Amino acid sequence: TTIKDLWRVLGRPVINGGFIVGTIIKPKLGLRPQPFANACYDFWLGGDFIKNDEPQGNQVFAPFKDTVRAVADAMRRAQDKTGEAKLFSFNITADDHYEMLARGEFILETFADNADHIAFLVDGYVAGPAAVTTARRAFPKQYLHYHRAGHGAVTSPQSK
Amino acid sequence: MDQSNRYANLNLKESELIAGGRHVLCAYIMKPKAGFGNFIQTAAHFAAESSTGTNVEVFTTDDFTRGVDALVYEVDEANSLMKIAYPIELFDRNVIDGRAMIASFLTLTIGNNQGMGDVEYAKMYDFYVPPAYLKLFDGPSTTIKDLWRVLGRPVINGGFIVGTIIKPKLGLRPQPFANACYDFWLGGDFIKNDEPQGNQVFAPFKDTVRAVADAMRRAQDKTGEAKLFSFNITADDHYEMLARGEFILETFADNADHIAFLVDGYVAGPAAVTTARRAFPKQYLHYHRAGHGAVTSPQSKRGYTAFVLSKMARLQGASGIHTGTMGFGKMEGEAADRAIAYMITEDAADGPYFHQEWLGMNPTTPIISGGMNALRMPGFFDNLGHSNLIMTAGGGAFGHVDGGAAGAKSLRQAEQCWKQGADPVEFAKDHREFARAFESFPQDADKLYPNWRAKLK
Amino acid sequence: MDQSNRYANLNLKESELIAGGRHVLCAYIMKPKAGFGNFIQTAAHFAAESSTGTNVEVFTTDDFTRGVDALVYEVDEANSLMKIAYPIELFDRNVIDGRAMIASFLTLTIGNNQGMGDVEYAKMYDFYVPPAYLKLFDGPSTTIKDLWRVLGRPVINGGFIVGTIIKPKLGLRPQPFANACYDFWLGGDFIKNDEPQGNQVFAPFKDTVRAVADAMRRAQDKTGEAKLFSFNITADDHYEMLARGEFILETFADNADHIAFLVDGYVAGPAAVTTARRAFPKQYLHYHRAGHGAVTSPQSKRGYTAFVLSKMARLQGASGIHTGTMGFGKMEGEAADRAIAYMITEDAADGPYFHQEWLGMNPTTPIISGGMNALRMPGFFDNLGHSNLIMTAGGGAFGHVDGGAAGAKSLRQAEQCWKQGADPVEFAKDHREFARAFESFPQDADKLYPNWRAK
Numbered sequence A: 001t002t003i004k005d006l007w008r009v010l011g012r013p014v015i016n017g018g019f020i021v022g023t024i025i026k027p028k029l030g031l032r033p034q035p036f037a038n039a040c041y042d043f044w045l046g047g048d049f050i051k052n053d054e055p056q057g058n059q060v061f062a063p064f065k066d067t068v069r070a071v072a073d074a075m076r077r078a079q080d081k082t083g084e085a086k087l088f089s090f091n092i093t094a095d096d097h098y099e100m101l102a103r104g105e106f107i108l109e110t111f112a113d114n115a116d117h118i119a120f121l122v123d124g125y126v127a128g129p130a131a132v133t134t135a136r137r138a139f140p141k142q143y144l145h146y147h148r149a150g151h152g153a154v155t156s157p158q159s160k
Numbered sequence B: 001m002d003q004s005n006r007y008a009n010l011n012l013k014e015s016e017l018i019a020g021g022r023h024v025l026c027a028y029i030m031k032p033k034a035g036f037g038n039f040i041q042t043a044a045h046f047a048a049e050s051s052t053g054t055n056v057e058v059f060t061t062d063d064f065t066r067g068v069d070a071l072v073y074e075v076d077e078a079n080s081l082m083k084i085a086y087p088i089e090l091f092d093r094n095v096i097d098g099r100a101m102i103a104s105f106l107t108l109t110i111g112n113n114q115g116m117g118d119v120e121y122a123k124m125y126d127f128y129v130p131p132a133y134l135k136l137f138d139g140p141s142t143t144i145k146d147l148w149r150v151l152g153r154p155v156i157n158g159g160f161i162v163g164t165i166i167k168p169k170l171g172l173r174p175q176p177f178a179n180a181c182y183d184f185w186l187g188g189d190f191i192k193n194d195e196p197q198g199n200q201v202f203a204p205f206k207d208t209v210r211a212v213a214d215a216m217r218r219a220q221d222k223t224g225e226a227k228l229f230s231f232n233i234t235a236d237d238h239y240e241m242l243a244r245g246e247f248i249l250e251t252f253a254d255n256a257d258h259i260a261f262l263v264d265g266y267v268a269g270p271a272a273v274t275t276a277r278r279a280f281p282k283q284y285l286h287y288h289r290a291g292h293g294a295v296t297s298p299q300s301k302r303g304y305t306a307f308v309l310s311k312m313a314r315l316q317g318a319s320g321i322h323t324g325t326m327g328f329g330k331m332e333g334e335a336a337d338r339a340i341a342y343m344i345t346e347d348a349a350d351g352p353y354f355h356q357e358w359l360g361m362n363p364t365t366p367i368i369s370g371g372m373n374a375l376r377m378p379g380f381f382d383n384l385g386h387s388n389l390i391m392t393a394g395g396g397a398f399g400h401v402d403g404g405a406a407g408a409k410s411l412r413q414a415e416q417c418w419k420q421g422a423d424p425v426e427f428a429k430d431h432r433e434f435a436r437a438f439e440s441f442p443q444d445a446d447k448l449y450p451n452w453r454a455k456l457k
Numbered sequence C: 001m002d003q004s005n006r007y008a009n010l011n012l013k014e015s016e017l018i019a020g021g022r023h024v025l026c027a028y029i030m031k032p033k034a035g036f037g038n039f040i041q042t043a044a045h046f047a048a049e050s051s052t053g054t055n056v057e058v059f060t061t062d063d064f065t066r067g068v069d070a071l072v073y074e075v076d077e078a079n080s081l082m083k084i085a086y087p088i089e090l091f092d093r094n095v096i097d098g099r100a101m102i103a104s105f106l107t108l109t110i111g112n113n114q115g116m117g118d119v120e121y122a123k124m125y126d127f128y129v130p131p132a133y134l135k136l137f138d139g140p141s142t143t144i145k146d147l148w149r150v151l152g153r154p155v156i157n158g159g160f161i162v163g164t165i166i167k168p169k170l171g172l173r174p175q176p177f178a179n180a181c182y183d184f185w186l187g188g189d190f191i192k193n194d195e196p197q198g199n200q201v202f203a204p205f206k207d208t209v210r211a212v213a214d215a216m217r218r219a220q221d222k223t224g225e226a227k228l229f230s231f232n233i234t235a236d237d238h239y240e241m242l243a244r245g246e247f248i249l250e251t252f253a254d255n256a257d258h259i260a261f262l263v264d265g266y267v268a269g270p271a272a273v274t275t276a277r278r279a280f281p282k283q284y285l286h287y288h289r290a291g292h293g294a295v296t297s298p299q300s301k302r303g304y305t306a307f308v309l310s311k312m313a314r315l316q317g318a319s320g321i322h323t324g325t326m327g328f329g330k331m332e333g334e335a336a337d338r339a340i341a342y343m344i345t346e347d348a349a350d351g352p353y354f355h356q357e358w359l360g361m362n363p364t365t366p367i368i369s370g371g372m373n374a375l376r377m378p379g380f381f382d383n384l385g386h387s388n389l390i391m392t393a394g395g396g397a398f399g400h401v402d403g404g405a406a407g408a409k410s411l412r413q414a415e416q417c418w419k420q421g422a423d424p425v426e427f428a429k430d431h432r433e434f435a436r437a438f439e440s441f442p443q444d445a446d447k448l449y450p451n452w453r454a455k
């Protein structure tokens, strides 16, 4: 999957479809499911794409399934209000391959007719290539968003 | 019962329906049966049976239902033409991933309407799929580019893939089967299973797969060139398809990207095509259409055309589909079938009634097969205009008098002649294997090249 | 190229080919195109393209190959008849369990031969399957007995299952859909999804399944009788079919044995039918044949007949298949179609060309549907001779002027009229739901019972 597939969902040209206006839900951690979804809705009134901040998932104060359901409702509301397609990139990173599958399968089923508006975020540097491949091979029709948190430990020019 | 007031709206404009992007359009050639309704009444009942209604009024109908009715928007009784607009909300979607299914498109648009007692016949000639519905289809994941890359060809306009089918259709035991493979691969690129070859008692699947893998490795060592094989993994059982594909990839090992999977998509159905597309997206999916002629033949006034079949196969995710020889081979076909190839390969193309934008959906290769040989190829290519495709010649290769390798070479040379714009008889004087195709198929040579004897001596 | 010396052996005796048990026999109505070969030459080429050959000689052919050639063994050019014997070794088998696949039978016997440039047309009217090949097919695992048992009927000759289809075909949202189910179930037994109903954006699958399960509980509590539902689980993706079926059974819970699974087997194909048969063998498999008319219609001279389709469906494992109304309803059909029902229900039966022994393979129910209503049923049963079947009437139930429940009772009562041997107009004098079906469908009433209003 490539940006072509995001441009197509947005109704843009599939060749040089242009700039995708995005954000990250901030606070990095701390928003409960409904204030999280309220921030999504607000941003989507003027923007295209939202990604989870890299550590957001299934914290005790923002359970994964409740957050996924509130975000799916916010996507429908924002799309109904604006008449424009909206995208979300969900963190499905886990140590356990079966947890990654369980997260991705739940998201696609929940988003239903908006399932092609979903990207899957993987923290590929800390979880490793095995986690990246789990998402690439299990969900090849969903845009795979590689987040590189931790890379700076070796990539910095300060490191030789 | 006259349902034309509900199901016909001839004041709708086709460009507004296309522009709106909320409807699938289908164009049919139809005739009412004698003693029932007129053309519009019959077309209206056809739309009702293809969307929300039945042959009588039901008291459970509400206005929400009426809003998703399929509508007859254009008729031309003189040319037996009927066009229907299907609201895209009617089509079924997967619960697991929200994607489209061709089974739902088929059920509504060419399902029960094919058994109506008040219709003599109705055949779909074209369909339009708007962006909102088009993007929900799988589309191809692997293309000819992936075969060209393995062959060391350019990934854009990589050219002609010289192929064959292992003949006899059935009857070769595993080692004679693999020997024919090896012989052809000394001069050619690609081999496909003949459509029914699989796990017959006399040619067990695992033994054949192992012998073919050894023949691929020996031909590649002998020639220094990459070779391809397309295996039939068709089964009624999904788990048998998986078991066949998994065994092949493991056995071929470092040559696993040289493998294509063949599915008899018309007889096994879209479910079998989707099993291969979704289980093995990194393996070229070769759609074989055995049985299609029962509806696609122009002799049939029912079902759908080969153009419609080919267009659906691209949505389903075939990497390639058999498009026929366009009148140049042994099966039914016409020169005008070149438009089928353009619909499945281009990003934008014209069907008989609708223009289609593919929005970057991957192309489906036209696979040319059916009574082809070296002698018939130049005329075929003149009609199509290119050779960025796979052509398989079973009888044309294994019926060459000097063997499979010579027959493969004869097909390579045929395309080299067409590419150089050469006269085939003159060209033949300097290309033996191609000149020996004249002697292997002397009935084709007398028809296509009269007096080839006097010049080829 | 004339291949008749190899692929035609008209000295073979059909009775010896049957007795040998080593061949599948197919009977076709075939016409050659002009300017090619004569009838036998064309039939021989047809057999070559349907077994071991092509249109030219290939030097890889050996005598072992010649031994598995399909052979033209009988021709009747005057009646355009061609009969071909296929050695059973030709047919593909599963690597995982050694069983047969209908996809291989179809590929060889009615595959590429349907695109031949030298044939005008060729349609299969009958086929014979010997014991050695027959026993390798799945066959049905669930039958009408399993529905009769759930209904509390005798498991032998349990009788007529009163059914409907939820109409509108599409458009009802989940609660309006479930309300129509509840209403019909107050008078009837069985409800099927209309063939395209599934997971439309306006009627999501899980919401509809949950509302229907609540309606089943309410109708069962109200009536004290068991109710059945046949859900469409058709999908291109095998994993979507499993996901739909698994959700339904879990949701219906203690009513899970009241569920049948509907598969659009002609458009989704044999692969979809086998997914349901093998994944859910304890759930009645309802084969819906939408699209079949493109080849089965007598207007077509290609492909195969409805008889051939129905016979294959029994081998595939359909618990039931739509066999049509045999000319009594809105779809194309002939009264002679009663022989289709007998082929799929009996242990031994005659097709147009071949007698078939089923060796105890389970029967497939004839599912009767398509423009049926209470008025048309007596004539239907008189032609068939029995009512041990499922009949679904969508328009016939939901077009009844007094509602779905009354619609259901008119169907029940019209079978009681036929079973009792009563005159339908006299019977209607004492059965109001039946009588009101005459008022609901007055054009059918005027044709079938001329002076019903006076009486």
Ligand SMILES: O=C(O)[C@@](O)(COP(=O)(O)O)[C@H](O)[C@H](O)COP(=O)(O)O
Binding pocket: B165, B167, B169, B194, B195, B289, B290, B322, B323, B324, B325, B330, B331, B368, B369, B370, B371, B372, B392, B393, B394, B395, B396, C049, C054, C055, C112, C115
């Ligand atoms: O079995 C055969 O006849 C072929 O292998 C061709 O063999 P030959 O080269 O010897 O003729 C193909 O299956 C047909 O081409 C199918 O027709 P189509 O491509 O139209 O679907």
Ligand SMILES: O=C(O)[C@@](O)(COP(=O)(O)O)[C@H](O)[C@H](O)COP(=O)(O)O
Binding pocket: B054, B055, B112, B115, C165, C167, C169, C194, C195, C289, C290, C322, C323, C324, C325, C330, C331, C368, C369, C370, C371, C372, C392, C393, C394, C395, C396
């Ligand atoms: O959609 C329909 O038309 C039906 O639900 C019948 O509804 P009605 O009762 O309202 O007519 C069935 O699918 C047809 O009977 C199929 O034909 P067949 O059984 O011949 O395959």
Ligand SMILES: [Mg+2]
Binding pocket: A024, A053, A054
């Ligand atoms: Mg971040």
Ligand SMILES: [Mg+2]
Binding pocket: B165, B193, B194, B195
């Ligand atoms: Mg073939």
Ligand SMILES: [Mg+2]
Binding pocket: C165, C194, C195
């Ligand atoms: Mg129906």
